Motif scaffolding. Sequence first.
Motif, PDB file in Angstrom:
ATOM      1  N   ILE A  72      87.615  48.089 -18.098  1.00  0.00           N
ATOM      2  CA  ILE A  72      87.669  47.675 -16.448  1.00  0.00           C
ATOM      3  C   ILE A  72      89.117  47.493 -15.878  1.00  0.00           C
ATOM      4  O   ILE A  72      89.090  48.075 -15.017  1.00  0.00           O
ATOM      5  CB  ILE A  72      86.482  46.531 -16.283  1.00  0.00           C
ATOM      6  CG1 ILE A  72      85.052  47.072 -16.384  1.00  0.00           C
ATOM      7  CG2 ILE A  72      86.757  46.052 -14.921  1.00  0.00           C
ATOM      8  CD1 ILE A  72      84.208  45.924 -16.173  1.00  0.00           C
ATOM      9  N   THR A  73      89.593  46.589 -16.676  1.00  0.00           N
ATOM     10  CA  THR A  73      91.034  46.266 -16.436  1.00  0.00           C
ATOM     11  C   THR A  73      91.957  47.711 -16.422  1.00  0.00           C
ATOM     12  O   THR A  73      92.929  47.810 -15.464  1.00  0.00           O
ATOM     13  CB  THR A  73      91.625  45.046 -17.184  1.00  0.00           C
ATOM     14  OG1 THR A  73      90.821  43.822 -16.660  1.00  0.00           O
ATOM     15  CG2 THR A  73      93.054  44.905 -16.927  1.00  0.00           C
ATOM     16  N   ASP A  74      91.783  48.196 -17.445  1.00  0.00           N
ATOM     17  CA  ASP A  74      92.595  49.515 -17.398  1.00  0.00           C
ATOM     18  C   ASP A  74      92.599  50.577 -16.332  1.00  0.00           C
ATOM     19  O   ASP A  74      93.341  51.029 -15.972  1.00  0.00           O
ATOM     20  CB  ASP A  74      92.460  50.268 -18.938  1.00  0.00           C
ATOM     21  CG  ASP A  74      93.073  49.163 -19.942  1.00  0.00           C
ATOM     22  OD1 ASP A  74      93.640  48.196 -19.784  1.00  0.00           O
ATOM     23  OD2 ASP A  74      92.991  49.737 -21.252  1.00  0.00           O
ATOM     24  N   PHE A  75      91.109  50.417 -15.924  1.00  0.00           N
ATOM     25  CA  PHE A  75      90.847  51.406 -14.868  1.00  0.00           C
ATOM     26  C   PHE A  75      91.282  50.976 -13.501  1.00  0.00           C
ATOM     27  O   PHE A  75      91.607  51.582 -12.819  1.00  0.00           O
ATOM     28  CB  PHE A  75      89.159  51.696 -14.925  1.00  0.00           C
ATOM     29  CG  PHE A  75      88.710  52.325 -13.602  1.00  0.00           C
ATOM     30  CD1 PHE A  75      88.746  53.592 -13.608  1.00  0.00           C
ATOM     31  CD2 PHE A  75      88.209  51.411 -12.785  1.00  0.00           C
ATOM     32  CE1 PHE A  75      88.164  54.256 -12.502  1.00  0.00           C
ATOM     33  CE2 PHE A  75      87.807  52.072 -11.569  1.00  0.00           C
ATOM     34  CZ  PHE A  75      87.548  53.439 -11.266  1.00  0.00           C
ATOM     35  N   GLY A  81      93.345  49.344  -6.312  1.00  0.00           N
ATOM     36  CA  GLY A  81      92.299  49.226  -5.123  1.00  0.00           C
ATOM     37  C   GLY A  81      91.005  49.293  -5.488  1.00  0.00           C
ATOM     38  O   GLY A  81      89.948  48.901  -4.962  1.00  0.00           O
ATOM     39  N   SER A  82      90.794  50.111  -6.485  1.00  0.00           N
ATOM     40  CA  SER A  82      89.415  50.132  -7.344  1.00  0.00           C
ATOM     41  C   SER A  82      88.961  48.904  -7.936  1.00  0.00           C
ATOM     42  O   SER A  82      89.661  47.886  -8.104  1.00  0.00           O
ATOM     43  CB  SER A  82      89.458  51.073  -8.396  1.00  0.00           C
ATOM     44  OG  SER A  82      89.798  52.241  -8.100  1.00  0.00           O
ATOM     45  N   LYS A  83      87.838  48.632  -7.949  1.00  0.00           N
ATOM     46  CA  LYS A  83      87.144  47.288  -8.430  1.00  0.00           C
ATOM     47  C   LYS A  83      85.848  47.758  -9.124  1.00  0.00           C
ATOM     48  O   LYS A  83      85.147  48.249  -8.377  1.00  0.00           O
ATOM     49  CB  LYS A  83      87.089  46.264  -7.082  1.00  0.00           C
ATOM     50  CG  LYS A  83      86.974  45.154  -7.386  1.00  0.00           C
ATOM     51  CD  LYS A  83      88.578  44.820  -7.684  1.00  0.00           C
ATOM     52  CE  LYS A  83      89.154  43.384  -8.269  1.00  0.00           C
ATOM     53  NZ  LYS A  83      90.404  43.196  -8.777  1.00  0.00           N
ATOM     54  N   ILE A  84      85.334  46.921 -10.258  1.00  0.00           N
ATOM     55  CA  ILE A  84      84.254  47.078 -10.748  1.00  0.00           C
ATOM     56  C   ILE A  84      84.031  45.759 -11.197  1.00  0.00           C
ATOM     57  O   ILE A  84      84.464  44.888 -11.808  1.00  0.00           O
ATOM     58  CB  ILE A  84      84.393  47.851 -12.057  1.00  0.00           C
ATOM     59  CG1 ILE A  84      84.793  49.386 -11.746  1.00  0.00           C
ATOM     60  CG2 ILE A  84      83.094  48.021 -12.895  1.00  0.00           C
ATOM     61  CD1 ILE A  84      84.933  50.419 -13.106  1.00  0.00           C
ATOM     62  N   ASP A  94      78.913  46.353  -9.558  1.00  0.00           N
ATOM     63  CA  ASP A  94      79.374  47.078  -8.246  1.00  0.00           C
ATOM     64  C   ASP A  94      80.836  47.602  -8.452  1.00  0.00           C
ATOM     65  O   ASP A  94      81.602  47.139  -8.875  1.00  0.00           O
ATOM     66  CB  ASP A  94      79.403  45.806  -7.085  1.00  0.00           C
ATOM     67  CG  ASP A  94      78.067  45.079  -6.733  1.00  0.00           C
ATOM     68  OD1 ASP A  94      77.308  45.721  -6.660  1.00  0.00           O
ATOM     69  OD2 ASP A  94      78.313  43.885  -6.692  1.00  0.00           O
ATOM     70  N   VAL A  95      80.643  48.895  -7.888  1.00  0.00           N
ATOM     71  CA  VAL A  95      81.992  49.813  -7.888  1.00  0.00           C
ATOM     72  C   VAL A  95      82.499  50.032  -6.561  1.00  0.00           C
ATOM     73  O   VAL A  95      81.709  50.510  -5.841  1.00  0.00           O
ATOM     74  CB  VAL A  95      81.547  50.855  -8.641  1.00  0.00           C
ATOM     75  CG1 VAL A  95      82.631  51.911  -8.770  1.00  0.00           C
ATOM     76  CG2 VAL A  95      80.918  50.709 -10.304  1.00  0.00           C
ATOM     77  N   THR A  96      83.716  49.916  -6.536  1.00  0.00           N
ATOM     78  CA  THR A  96      84.466  50.479  -5.308  1.00  0.00           C
ATOM     79  C   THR A  96      85.659  51.037  -5.595  1.00  0.00           C
ATOM     80  O   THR A  96      86.318  50.711  -6.478  1.00  0.00           O
ATOM     81  CB  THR A  96      84.912  49.359  -4.548  1.00  0.00           C
ATOM     82  OG1 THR A  96      83.745  48.438  -3.741  1.00  0.00           O
ATOM     83  CG2 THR A  96      85.578  49.736  -3.199  1.00  0.00           C
ATOM     84  N   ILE A  97      85.591  52.420  -5.218  1.00  0.00           N
ATOM     85  CA  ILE A  97      86.849  53.206  -5.626  1.00  0.00           C
ATOM     86  C   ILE A  97      87.531  53.905  -4.119  1.00  0.00           C
ATOM     87  O   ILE A  97      86.985  54.326  -3.224  1.00  0.00           O
ATOM     88  CB  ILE A  97      86.312  54.499  -6.178  1.00  0.00           C
ATOM     89  CG1 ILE A  97      85.447  54.352  -7.251  1.00  0.00           C
ATOM     90  CG2 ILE A  97      87.532  55.587  -6.317  1.00  0.00           C
ATOM     91  CD1 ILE A  97      84.829  55.464  -8.006  1.00  0.00           C
ATOM     92  N   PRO A  98      88.655  53.459  -3.852  1.00  0.00           N
ATOM     93  CA  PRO A  98      89.416  53.923  -2.718  1.00  0.00           C
ATOM     94  C   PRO A  98      89.235  55.552  -2.614  1.00  0.00           C
ATOM     95  O   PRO A  98      89.424  56.138  -3.374  1.00  0.00           O
ATOM     96  CB  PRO A  98      90.863  53.538  -2.907  1.00  0.00           C
ATOM     97  CG  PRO A  98      91.030  53.567  -4.530  1.00  0.00           C
ATOM     98  CD  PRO A  98      89.532  53.021  -4.982  1.00  0.00           C
TER      99      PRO A  98
END
Length: 150
Positions: A72-75, A81-84, A94-98
């Motif tokens: 998760i952190t490496d991603f 801007g991404s968040k898991i 919950d996944v957010t990808i710019p």
Amino acid sequence: TSSVFYYKTGDMLPEDTTHVRWFLNINNEKSYVSKDITIKDQIQGGQQLDLSTLNINVTGTHSNYYSGQSAITDFEKAFPGSKITVDNTKNTIDVTIPQGYGSYNSFSINYKTKITNEQQKEFVNNSQAWYQEHGKEEVNGKSFNHTVHN
């Protein structure tokens, strides 16, 4: 000719009857994306998310494979801007990808859930998506659920 921007699937390996494998397959055709991609996932009853099994495979312009305990952190680091967001107690992801990073890349997020009710026959995973491919109608809150049978 085939094309589904996002879909959720899952299975049970017959050699491992205590885990259910789940797959969130995002931007399968590697389209340009007009808005951020947001996926809301709620794992249902009788199973527990095994966070240590969470891996993300990105293919396209930024091909990389994230696995292990820092996945998760490496991603999130690679895709600013991404968040898991995982809540191990609630079993939600919950996944957010710019949109800039969502564009031209397919993301396959996989994880397993440990079965905690050996008697249960069906395990379901519900998810809702918010996205918009270039030139297509915006998708908001649409449900993409899946039930693994036993």
